[PDB]
Design a protein around this ligand. Structure first.
Ligand SMILES: Nc1ncnc2c1ncn2[C@@H]1O[C@H](CSCC[C@H](N)C(=O)O)[C@@H](O)[C@H]1O
Ligand SMILES: Nc1ncnc2c1ncn2[C@@H]1O[C@H](CSCC[C@H](N)C(=O)O)[C@@H](O)[C@H]1O
Ligand SMILES: O=C1c2ccc(O)cc2O[C@H](O)[C@H]1c1ccc(O)cc1
Ligand SMILES: O=C1c2ccc(O)cc2O[C@H](O)[C@H]1c1ccc(O)cc1
Lengths: 358, 358
């Protein structure tokens, strides 16, 4: 009946999702335009003309800059303000100021995420979607990227004709790992009362080095495969140890599992977690395991956060056929391991730091 | 100080925008997968397996279907439910049901928008974004599509090697104009008390035909250029008249300006509006002008709607260098024309029907 009526808010819901990609493209444009850097360097609200002047735009592109700015401002990446104006011409003009979100676009700052936005929205990241239909209906098990190009993402980046793309990718990854320092500074409480720590899968020690920049007195042990640690000797508080995390992990007050469980199924992840609990048993109820990975909480009140996490989960699937765990999956893993409780702390926009206790 | 601290919710805001495109790709996948049609045809909640069965997916793609479904469900395009299960195997399974938004994906229904979602998210609509940086920094005034391909969007669609793309585009346009019928049925109040109506730029009469399907007694006059109307004769309530809307418009109780002012600057739009007021003067304070176009209300409480409108405005700019007016621009136009008041009614998700009064 009147149900057939009301072209509902169903139509508006449908359309908002159809055109959501635009918000991503507008943001991408803001970083490639270097708007944040221009405003930051001006050290004061910038006018449309001043900004157009700083970007050395052709007069015909000014109105395009304006359109992108209006949308970005509405989306909270810039704040509009009012300024007077020099000379006897003109009258009253609007100026633009950065906001916390856009300040993350200021290059040369430990907080700059420009490289990640550039790569996550590079043609090599997005063009494959045109092969989505063919991807669902084929008999071949492969990533969406492989279905669209015929080669894995990694092989693509390592082609001579993709030299710059690979460097773009490694810039983003290096920038991402760098953000871990911010995580440490922002959650000192987590490592504060520790005397020792073992960085599992710590490789050559890059992560423990950041850890030391914040906690120079913490005794850290970089645990990894015999071939990775090999020679590497340390200092008073730096230690390198080789072994197999599936058999055992060096004892310490805390065990760090940074982006480790991510690459393992439940069976393998449980064994690591169990060896982790055993590596801290000596410390009793004072020991702890620190997991740094993504946790998708569907029952979360922040629908937007969960959506972003799920979005990112869909990228992992299409690009690598990878996966991220939900809060539940984590809980099942944590308790199956024998731990008593746990606490999740949101970090880096949508990642999670999990404190697990015996 | 501690301001430097807090990697704020700035990071989460930044990332939510980076990955917004995923929601658009997931929706696109839902339509190409024909999920809505499969559920609709089943006439009852469908299980993951049943749905995988209906789509004839290779067993390895089932888990991919599941991942897309989880995200789409979170985004409100499907609703999760619980069903029992036949035979002695199994236990308890989740089923999926459509929601108002996904029902707009059921093909063969006057409400189907599948074709629009397909085109708006086709490679020909999205791939050009890789040329955005070059587009801002060049000296040539052209659309982003022209900058990326070297040819206008229209010329592209009319190439022999793009035969199917053009038909895809015309399917969406035909589907869009068809939705106008829903607008009429949903806003009878607007045309109810009218005796006569003049459809300006009505072409060969396609719009007046839909109008008659709902108001068979309304005397309609299809006004357009002499060459367009030409021969065309009508009936008792159908009338064809040729002329120049910039010089004058046939008198009637109401003047319909459906997607007309959109293609004209303020100077030309004002003249049309003035001729429109004169075409209804005879009816006095009872006459009205009906404008069907987009109106972007920045001060609107529905931030999401404005964003969508701005998003769509950015597509018009990149694809055609076109533009949409804001509520203010409309008000300035309406009053400069001499009208007393106006009312805006939201239609088709993000469009607007404007009632203007003398
Ligand atoms: N059996 C095993 N025991 C210990 N480390 C192992 C292992 N098998 C693989 N690895 C290690 O797994 C590591 C994954 S890299 C994980 C990321 C890292 N913690 C960071 O912060 O960047 C590699 O360094 C690899 O050498
Ligand atoms: N001076 C003029 N007077 C009347 N119509 C004109 C005109 N110049 C152009 N047009 C008409 O402008 C129309 C734009 S098409 C507008 C869309 C139409 N009302 C719909 O509902 O689809 C064309 O049909 C064209 O013939
Ligand atoms: O940061 C990311 C990213 C950065 C640059 C690039 O060119 C592609 C990308 O893909 C994703 O968008 C994302 C990513 C995250 C983790 C990972 O291991 C791989 C990619
Ligand atoms: O519906 C639209 C659309 C449909 C199919 C297609 O292949 C491209 C498109 O571009 C936009 O996404 C949108 C549009 C709207 C009005 C218009 O005049 C042109 C395009």
């Amino acid at each position: 009946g009147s149900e057939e009526s009301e072209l509902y808010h169903a139509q508006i819901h449908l359309y908002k999702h159809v055109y959501n990609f635009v918000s991503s493209m507008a943001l991408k444009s803001a970083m490639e335009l270097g708007i944040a850097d221009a405003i930051h360097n001006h050290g004061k609200p910038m006018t449309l003309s001043e900004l157009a002047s700083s970007l050395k735009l052709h007069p015909s592109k000014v109105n395009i800059l304006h359109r992108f700015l209006r949308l970005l401002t509405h989306n909270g990446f810039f704040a509009k303000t009012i300024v007077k104006g020099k000379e006897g011409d003109e009258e009253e003009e609007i100026a633009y100021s950065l906001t916390p979100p856009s300040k993350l676009l200021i290059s040369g700052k430990p907080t700059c995420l420009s490289s990640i936005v550039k790569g996550a929205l590079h043609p090599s990241s997005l063009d494959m979607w045109s092969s989505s239909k063919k991807w669902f209906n084929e008999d071949k098990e492969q990533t969406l990227f492989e279905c669209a190009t015929g080669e894995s993402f990694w092989d693509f980046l390592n082609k001579d004709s993709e030299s710059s793309t690979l460097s773009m990718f490694q810039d983003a990854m290096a920038s991402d790992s760098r953000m871990f320092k911010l995580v440490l500074q922002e959650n000192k409480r987590v490592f504060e009362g520790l005397e020792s720590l073992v960085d599992v899968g710590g490789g050559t020690g890059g992560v423990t080095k950041l850890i030391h920049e914040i906690f120079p007195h913490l005794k850290c042990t970089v645990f990894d495969q015999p071939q990775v640690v090999g020679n590497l000797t340390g200092n008073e508080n730096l230690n390198f140890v080789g072994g197999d995390m599936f058999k055992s992990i060096p004892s310490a007050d805390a065990v760090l599992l940074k982006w480790v469980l991510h690459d393992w199924n439940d069976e393998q992840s449980l064994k690591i977690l169990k060896n982790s609990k055993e590596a801290i048993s000596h410390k009793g109820k004072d020991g702890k395991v620190i997991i740094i990975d993504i946790s998708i909480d569907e029952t979360s009140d922040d629908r937007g956060l969960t959506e972003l996490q799920l979005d990112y989960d869909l990228v992992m699937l299409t690009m690598f056929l990878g996966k991220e765990r939900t809060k539940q999956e984590w809980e099942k893993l944590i308790y199956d391991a024998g731990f008593s409780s746990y606490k999740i702390t949101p970090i880096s926009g949508f990642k999670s730091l999990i404190e697990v206790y015996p």
